[PDB]
Amino acid sequence: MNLRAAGPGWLFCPADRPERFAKAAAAADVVILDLEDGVAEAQKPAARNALRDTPLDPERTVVRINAGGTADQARDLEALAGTAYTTVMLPKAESAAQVIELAPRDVIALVETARGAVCAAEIAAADPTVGMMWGAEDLIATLGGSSSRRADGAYRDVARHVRSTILLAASAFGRLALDAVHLDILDVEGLQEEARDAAAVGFDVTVCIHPSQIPVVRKAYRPSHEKLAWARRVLAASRSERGAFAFEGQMVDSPVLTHAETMLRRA
Amino acid sequence: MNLRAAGPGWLFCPADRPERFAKAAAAADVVILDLEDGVAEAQKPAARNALRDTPLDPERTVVRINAGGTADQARDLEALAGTAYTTVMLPKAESAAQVIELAPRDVIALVETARGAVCAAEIAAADPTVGMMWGAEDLIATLGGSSSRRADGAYRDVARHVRSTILLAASAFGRLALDAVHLDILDVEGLQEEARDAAAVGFDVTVCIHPSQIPVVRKAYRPSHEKLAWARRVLAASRSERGAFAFEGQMVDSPVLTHAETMLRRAG
Amino acid sequence: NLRAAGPGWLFCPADRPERFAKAAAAADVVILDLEDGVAEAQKPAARNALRDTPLDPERTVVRINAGGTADQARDLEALAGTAYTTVMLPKAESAAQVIELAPRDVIALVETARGAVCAAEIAAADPTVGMMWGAEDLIATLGGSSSRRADGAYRDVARHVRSTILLAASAFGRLALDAVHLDILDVEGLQEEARDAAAVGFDVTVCIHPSQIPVVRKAYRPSHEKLAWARRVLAASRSERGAFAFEGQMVDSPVLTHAETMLRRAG
Ligand SMILES: CC(C)(COP(=O)(O)OP(=O)(O)OC[C@H]1O[C@@H](n2cnc3c(N)ncnc32)[C@H](O)[C@@H]1OP(=O)(O)O)[C@@H](O)C(=O)NCCC(=O)NCCSC(=O)C[C@](C)(O)C(=O)O
Ligand SMILES: CC(C)(COP(=O)(O)OP(=O)(O)OC[C@H]1O[C@@H](n2cnc3c(N)ncnc32)[C@H](O)[C@@H]1OP(=O)(O)O)[C@@H](O)C(=O)NCCC(=O)NCCSC(=O)C[C@](C)(O)C(=O)O
Ligand SMILES: [Cl-]
Ligand SMILES: [Cl-]
Ligand SMILES: [Cl-]
Ligand SMILES: [Cl-]
Ligand SMILES: [Cl-]
Ligand SMILES: [Mg+2]
Ligand SMILES: [Mg+2]
Ligand SMILES: [Mg+2]
């Protein structure tokens, strides 16, 4: 499954609403068909049914199953067997074992508890892992907290800390890195801010919970006109330089040039 | 010991000031009698005596002993053997071994050095551990630094980093989580900001160094009437919804409803 | 001995021997660079310069190329015919990479996700005498495009790695070196970074231009106000036992340690 080839705009779609699968697919780069928290306990069997009977392109679809050790997950895997879906998202991911027990599937580990943050490197390193995501809301919920963001809307420190932990663990083992959802759907400004930053630090994906968010996300992962203009400027300049040199008041060498090239590629 | 159901307002009181033990207990939800940095080396023997002579409710009292590998700690423990106290706070906690050697006692590990932060998971996992606290000042001290906060009062990055490290380590192992003391006694504004935020992210306790701070802390761990109203509205709303649903412009699913219920618990 | 020298350390590409003397005079320690400051085609010339224009080995570090690279092998061959005993290892990612540089002392430059994840093991390695972090390769290797946000602060993942390296170094009694300030003429920003670095116990701020050295050296010396407080509170402490209130603050041992650290940095 060529996840890196697909866009940065992924979308959660509750699996007990098969009448929306087609549109989610159309609006998003990758759809995450959700059997976990997006669907009530009593609608999960129906959700599983909808999953076998309403196929989306398995090359552009991931299924979030239920957490390790839950009876629900067992049901999910049985139902999954009647689909073409090769990639699953494991919520409350908390150990390498939880990932290993899903072989031979590809696994996107969703770290959203303190235990998962503590075990991030082991989780990322596990052989089936193809990506890591973080979730601020279960994180806060399982910490015994009540709020992931402060007054002004900025993530509180522990959420910011887990975000970095996941980005690092993912990158250290060559895994996709997926940034967290933006629950305030009409906060397009906040979303744009997060998604631009995500792209800047090397996240590959920002996950969305509403289709109106996908265009914002796609736009944000395209380098700004200003940044792109600089990239061309500094690269042209370096053609005439050997090793370190000063450009526009800044010391420039290898990795700075790599940043500019990455910007060009992203466009 | 039912520490988790004690209240979030803990108060340090140096153990060489027994005449102040009573005020301490009256003011706070839990008192930490201190044999370590709160008490000069020459006064520690008197503090060990005061420990025995002026007993407090052992259900609402923890004793901070001295660090592992010190002559002081050995005497602290000898003195504790003659008390009712079963829960100790271990300063400069730096390894699981330092916690384990304290069994069968319950141990709150106070991580306040780079080594302890680096071993936070191992320390939290140790069997006798029932809680984790962090300390910014010994952290900066042992780092070779000179201030834990920048000009505007915010903690410097390495301190904010260790705070999160300790919250996650504690919570990964089901331990109590205690937030760092607020040393600016007169800065009630900052204490309020910290305690509200601590409450928001799941710290169970904000440790105080002055009784005047306890009310500030207590008020901070109770959600706004505004947050409560919201919690009641979204929970009522969810009763007629299946799974994820949009509410007042927000996407709402399981953990959001948990947040709401947590508000209602911290309150009613 | 490196640990005895000032906090002002200066990179100088080793293909610029005519600059060596000025760098040595301007800075406490000089880091002669064989890696990213020098174009590949210029590396052999840089190695010759390293051999032909020596600096005081007690005040000089050589940054070699990364573990496993053909360049590093050539670097070490060149170095055998020098008096240099401390090297900086870029893209430091394991204890093993440090250990193979024995019997030299090693400053591990952590600047990749893998390096951040393995920071404690790298710091603990026997040859390690210090740790540095590199914001630009960190971002480059994460697949990102900028280490700093619009307001100039480092992005979170950079700030996160900064503390990781500081803690790892300190946990194992290693020197801690803060990242270069690429904006040469931005002495205001450099001052802010260095004052903060000194405050949290970094031992060195690395510079990329001689003009930055004075700024770093001043920032690592406490202000007159801070020095006055330090003398004040230490005086006050002798009349006090254990914890006591001083100027609105609670004071005990570690606060007095901070004071003494200010004094030491002042003479
Ligand atoms: C700062 C001090 C010395 C000033 O004490 P004061 O008497 O000079 O201040 P005050 O405002 O004049 O006190 C007035 C009233 O408050 C009482 N009072 C005041 N404080 C307390 C108290 N703690 N417990 C019980 N009662 C207290 C006091 O006795 C008096 O009662 P009164 O009106 O009836 O006469 C005092 O507040 C105190 O001792 N606080 C706690 C000190 C302590 O325990 N420090 C160790 C923990 S902090 C630490 O080590 C960091 C960490 C984590 O380790 C790391 O970051 O590295
Ligand atoms: C940027 C450059 C090329 C501008 O060079 P320039 O000639 O254009 O600058 P200048 O202002 O005109 O220089 C004025 C005078 O100072 C001198 N000078 C100026 N710089 C130095 C120096 N470093 N050492 C010794 N002398 C220096 C220079 O020779 C000249 O002498 P003069 O008065 O006789 O005319 C120059 O400053 C330089 O080479 N700086 C260091 C470059 C370097 O080593 N970069 C590698 C480390 S940064 C890195 O890789 C990232 C990291 C951590 O790995 C990751 O974040 O990933
Ligand atoms: Cl299918
Ligand atoms: Cl494995
Ligand atoms: Cl003393
Ligand atoms: Cl090149
Ligand atoms: Cl200063
Ligand atoms: Mg979740
Ligand atoms: Mg302390
Ligand atoms: Mg580099």
Author numbering:
A (entry chain C): 9 to 275
B (entry chain B): 9 to 276
C (entry chain A): 10 to 276
Task: Quote the original article.
In contrast to the previously reported structures, the C terminus (50 residues) is well ordered in our structures, forming an α-helix/β-hairpin/α-helix motif that packs against the surface of the neighboring protomer, capping its active site. Of note, the structure with (S)-citramalyl-CoA bound was obtained from crystals that were soaked with pyruvate and Ac-CoA, therefore indicating that the conformation of Rv2498c in the crystals is catalytically active. The CoA moiety binds in a deep cleft at the base of which resides the active site Mg2+ ion. The Mg2+ ion is coordinated by the 3-hydroxyl group and by an unidentate interaction with the terminal carboxylate of the ligand, as well as by Glu112, Asp138, and 2 water molecules. The carboxylate of the substrate is further positioned by polar interactions with the backbone NH atoms of Ala136, Glu137, and Asp138, while the 3-hydroxyl group lies close to Arg64. The 3-methyl group of the ligand contacts a hydrophobic surface formed by Gly135 and the side-chain atoms of Met133 and Val181. Because the citramalyl group observed in the active site was in the S configuration, which corresponds to the R configuration at the 3-position of HMG-CoA, we modeled the mode of binding of (R)-HMG-CoA to further understand the molecular basis for the (S)-HMG-CoA lyase associated with mammalian l-leucine catabolism. In this case, the additional methylene unit (C4) found in HMG-CoA is readily accommodated in the active site and can support a less distorted octahedral coordination of the Mg2+ ion (the bite angle of the citramalyl group is ∼70°; the modeled HMG moiety bite angle is ∼85°). Our crystal structures for full-length Rv2498c shed light into the molecular basis of substrate specificity and stereoselectivity for (S)-citramalyl-CoA and revealed how the C-terminal domain interacts directly with the neighboring CoA substrate, therefore playing an important role in substrate binding selectivity.
Mtb protein Rv2498c is currently annotated as the β-subunit (CitE) of the heterotrimeric prokaryotic citrate lyase complex involved in TCA cycle cataplerosis. Combining phylogenetic analysis, in vitro enzymatic assays, in vivo Mtb experiments, and X-ray crystallography, we identified Mtb Rv2498c as an essential stereospecific bifunctional β-hydroxyacyl-CoA lyase (β-HAC lyase) that carries out the last step of itaconate dissimilation pathway and confers resistance to itaconate. To investigate the molecular basis of Rv2498c substrate stereospecificity for the carbon–carbon bond, we determined the structures of Rv2498c in a variety of liganded states by X-ray crystallography.
